[PDB]
């Protein structure tokens, strides 16, 4: 649990695209404590509302016909967020890459450690706000 670091595990199995996020609360909300005031209350609500749009946090090509099947959000109060997302991509052959928008929604994240398991290969890469491409 390192502030500014986010864990990203992507699994691709047939039409199943599963992405899991482990993010410190400092990255997602801007602080890991109980909301002191209304500003912080809004920060938390904005975050939680953002976390249920993995289709905004991960740019999936329309051609891949990716539909959201699962949105799980776990907040543990330090403080941590786990999000687990499942897409069913009816043209998964056309999902060449994912362009993560994480750094745009949560700019206090500096690096994501991405693990990508597909039918063909495991691969790792470190992402930043400028290098957001994941190849499948
Ligand atoms: Zn929403
Ligand atoms: Zn912490
Ligand atoms: Zn299918």
Numbering used by the authors: 35 to 111, 123, 185 to 242
Source paper text:
Thus, the ZrgA proteins appear to represent a newly discovered family of zinc SBPs widespread among Gram-negative bacteria, including human pathogens. Here, we have determined the crystal structure of ZrgA from Vibrio cholerae and characterized its zinc binding in vitro and function in vivo. ZrgA adopts a ferredoxin-like fold, albeit with different topology from the classic ferredoxin (fd), that bears no similarity to known SBPs. Here, we show that ZrgA likely functions as the SBP for the ZrgBC permease/ATPase transporter system as it is required for normal growth and survival in zinc-deficient conditions in the ΔznuA background.
Since zinc-bound ZrgA would not crystallize, zinc was soaked into crystals of apo Δ124-184 ZrgA to acquire the holo protein structure at 2.41 Å resolution. We also acquired a dataset at the zinc absorption edge to generate an anomalous density map, which allowed us to model a total of 21 zinc ions into the asymmetric unit. These fall into 5 different binding sites. Sites 1 and 2 are observed in every chain with strong anomalous density and relatively low B-factors for the zinc ion. Site 1 is coordinated by the previously disordered His 35 and His 37 as well as Glu 66. Site 1 is conserved in PA4063 where a fourth His aligning with His 184 in ZrgA coordinates the metal. Site 2 is observed on the long alpha helix and is shared between two chains, one containing ligands Glu 83, His 86 and His 87, the other contributing Glu 79. Site 3 is located at the opposite end of the protein from site 1 and is coordinated by residues His 49, His 194, and Glu 196. Although the structures of apo and holo ZrgA are very similar with RMSD ~ 0.5 Å, they do reveal a few interesting conformational changes accompanying zinc binding, particularly near site 1. Further, the loop containing Glu 66 moves approximately 4 Å to allow zinc coordination.
